[model samples]
Target: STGSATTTPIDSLDDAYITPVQIGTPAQTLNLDFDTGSSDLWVFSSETTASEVDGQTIYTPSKSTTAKLLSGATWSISYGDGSSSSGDVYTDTVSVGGLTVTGQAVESAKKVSSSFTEDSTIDGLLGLAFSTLNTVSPTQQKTFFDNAKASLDSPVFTADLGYHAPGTYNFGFIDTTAYTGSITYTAVSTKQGFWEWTSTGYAVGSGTFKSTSIDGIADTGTTLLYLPATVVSAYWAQVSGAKSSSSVGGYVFPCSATLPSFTFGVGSARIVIPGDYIDFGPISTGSSSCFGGIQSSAGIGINIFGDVALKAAFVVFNGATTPTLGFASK
Candidate 1:
């Protein structure tokens, strides 16, 4: 099957959005978030000192004989999370699926802060979602996607996630099996320059949740999904035994059991939010559970629809053609 194609690098910053990507094919697997703001591809290493990282998973370069360091290209990266890591530059034969890209640039973090050690849910990032923000050939930027794009067995890639539900992210070719009839298309905006979505409205459980709003970019960058407080409270109100709790970062809720399915209004179309997102286990305190949908960031500039809402739908950032966000069913 053939369709129009596009690629847009998330050149701008949007916290910890993810680029549903994987590193190393068949032999080993490392699921990573595709991040564009930074140009380094780093992983936790077995050789990394625990003192350096509070307790993060480090990828053993020795484990992959193909992993090689660039010797002098030492580097470090900072995240919106206030986490930082300093390490040396290395090159490896990194592959995304059957695509074998040799001499690919990679970062081997030797020293890590508490931020790197504490966050364990994700392994690493596989940025390359956008071109404008890419660390490519010019030697200024280096991303797995930047190198792999030219070597991949299939030039096309697609991301499909189930969120709290079971989902799979696929790259290379857009699988026809995952789509329904004709997909409703939206043109990308050159001015914005990222994967932006234009939706009609937002709703919860079933009906329209809120008025129509052109929120902003549906980034894979930030972690928690930041929805309007009204939408967040609307969802919490439905939980039978849900109670709100205050925490350092924001307000979270403790759930007695699985919650209801909330829906997002996308241009006369709707996408469901699974229950798992509402009550992910164990926040900082250990006794309280966190709210999956909204976080209270009073001073923050942007509202991000994190992986929770994203995983439930088939997301297409037609950056290869234009900067637009398209949705589908998996």
Candidate 2:
């Protein structure tokens, strides 16, 4: 796959500022977001006054003593998180994990004002998601996965967000030990790079996915899953003696504390959702209850398989061709 590597954009990082990247031999260092909603790898430079950067983490070109800028070109990025940044373009060495690539495309931010600067815990996003969605030039759009395919020992990338445990991102090599050797591949549409999935059906606990199967899209950019109230209510009906309880928002369950496991069919792919994530809080009496994992987004129309679902799998986005979204190790 050396000559045929795929790529996608770095959309998730729109909320975080990326550090300058060096993309060549000897390797380089850069910051990035593991975004799926948008594409591209960008960074901020000294030209962007500290004030403009405000709360953004600025990439130090001088620190490398080897950073270089492109002439006459400018870079600007708009994020779904309700903010944007603009600046210049540059080529330098970029490093991720243990791989360093030279002549990498890096957006040097001169001005920025996005919600990205507000959160300090996350620096930049390493978007290994896709290449076509990349903010970089179509001719130069390349994601970490695309570049790594040639050098990395494995053809896989796993995102183990210790969202629960270690509290750190497990990047680089695919930890084969943590996942099944096989993966699920879902084709993407041309309009955008979003992961549009096919519906087989829905299920809770040992229950089955009735004719109630649903269809929609799954994205990391969104934080929660939005489903029709009727769909959510119907899905919860399967839980063993299911009833509703409360903790945070709304949820469904039975009088017994035994929360059931939920599953959704995306074509042939069966995604299982645990009760803890789905049953955040219980609603009113009877089965007409609300759940945390599933919410009433009747107005939104489209269903968003958010972080709750993605948390269970390591997603791989290929931007080289048709912008395919695939899943692998975790």
Candidate 3:
């Protein structure tokens, strides 16, 4: 099996990259956020109420000859940011890049939270995590990658996320041309149904690199990088006029502040996150108040290396034995 496929980012807004995924027989294309945090291929569908549909494209199973209802099967999901969706299930053909999976479980959203209903750009979420985390009732569902891995040459996928630019997701093999420097591999611990790994240490700018192990997950669906409160405070302390804003929430700094670069360690490898990456746009457009992309994951439990950190490196999610993560500078 030596199959491969290339998927380009459809839209890049505030670091949230959306990719086009074709579902069903004739292919009802939907703009989805490829999420490594969850494991359910859910989409907006005709079952959703008209008022809740908004501007997102809906998937109609009746139009696809290959589509089949899973009887009484249903699915419901909630995100770390409070976004939630629930609906019925259907088995259909799903294609990403050029790779296709027949009889893939597709959850159709009939009910959605305001967080998802208001987001007009994203039509659904294509989960890339382990199939063990799928939300389908009665029987667990397999992810597209899991169902298609046997046909993939390497059983791996590479995410080439970029800052304010279009990126690509390659399946089946790694693209050496997408990144620079040698790839540093880290063992992944998927006990929590996530691509969880530990960082040996971290540093801010040219300062001393602290050697404290931090367990975090590489979540593509999350927009910002989340760290421990103490770690976030340490980095923000270096910036002038940086403080935790109650009204805006999280850490905020002046738009013109000279932010320092942040670096995290994975074994012997150092992944440097650019200073500008932390400056995650303005607080409210035209306002000099800017929000720091790196924030405290106090309530979120574990830290997350979201798009802000992911854009700084080329990531390889190896689904082979032991499931490891390989990172390299872009």
Candidate 4:
């Protein structure tokens, strides 16, 4: 009747979260990165060339009895990080948690960029964005969520991501126990096939809330929180010796420096991200300077509320006739 799958970060920095999905005959399980920023359900597969293959688990369609090649259908997706993959398409029975969806488009990667080939923790990507963002050509395919929505008790899904502990992605129903207090609802814009919403304001540590509507996407696929340049500069200003170092790529501060918590508004409700969360990690193996998880979206063009922001709350992606996003503190 519903589905709930546990997801956990593979690295110490919590860069990407992986969840298991059952695909193909005899139900081969592959760990996939759940990316809400994209809409391509692709896997490193048998069709991929040897050089592109690292230690990733490959999906061999030939071995699956239910697989059907989608002739002339091709897909190529380029991510924000510059990593890309392209390949042939096949329709197969795919299931996550316990929810099954037949004839799901399973893009088999023929070529994966170097970044993906180097990351062995994830076998493929399970995109949770709107079907409109799917990269299939000639005939676009629907996402697993879209296909399963008809059978779902509610056309919705929730992400409960944790800092160090394992999190869960639930489909159809909201688990009241996963969060505290009432959920705050906001309108969602599907104009670009993203879960785009606007935050009422933001505050640095206990500073005054800057009353400004900032439009951004709730992207689980991304790693950090990217805001406007002004906001980014303001937050980093509080930290001593913190500067945007071209050498380190973003803002870096002394590991021993005191960092203030960051707070952002969801309508009238506010969510606070502890100071420790912003101190992403050490610059090098044993460097005294550490990287900041929050960055400027000036050049990225799109403001993204990535994993850093998500792990602080329980989020609901309500796919109703008029789609809306709901947020609750956990």
How do these models rank on TM-score, best leading? 4, 3, 1, 2
lDDT of 2: 0.54
TM-score of each: 0.73, 0.66, 0.96, 0.98
Candidate 4, which segments miss by more than 4 Å at Cα? none
Q: Give the C-alpha miss distance for residue 328 in model 3, angstroms.
A: 0.6
Q: Using TM-score, give the best candidate's number.
A: 4
Q: For residues 2-39, what per-residue lDDT tens digits would candidate 3 score against the true structure?
A: 33343344443455778889998789999888999999
Pairs that collide in candidate 4 are: none
lDDT of 4 by residue, 1-330 (tens): 689999999888888899999999878788999988899999989999899888988899999999999999999999999999999999999999999999999999999999999999989999999999999998999888998998999999999887977899999999999999999999999999999999998999989999999999999999899999999999999999999998888899999988898888899998888887787878998999999989999899899999999988999999898899999999
Q: Candidate 2 has what TM-score?
A: 0.66
lDDT of each: 0.54, 0.54, 0.88, 0.92
* Candidate 3 local Cα displacement, residue 122, angstroms: 0.5
Specify the poorest-scoring 10-residue window by lDDT in model 4.
Answer: 272-281
Error of 1 at 241 (Å): 7.4
Separately for all candidates shown, the number of backbone clashes (residues 3 or more apart, or on different chains) is 30, 51, 0, 0
lDDT of 2 by residue, 125-222 (tens): 54544455666542445655566565655455444332233212333444446556566777666454455655567776787665555656656555
- Candidate 3 has its poorest 10 consecutive residues by lDDT at 1-10
lDDT per residue for candidate 1 within 1-330, as digits (tens), equals 222222222222112333222233223454455542344676666656667654444566666667665665766666656777666655776655445566766666677777656655445665544444433233444455555555444544555654423334455556667666434445544443345555666666665566567464565555556666666667767765555555345555564556677777666667767666555555544565644455543355545566556666677554453344567644
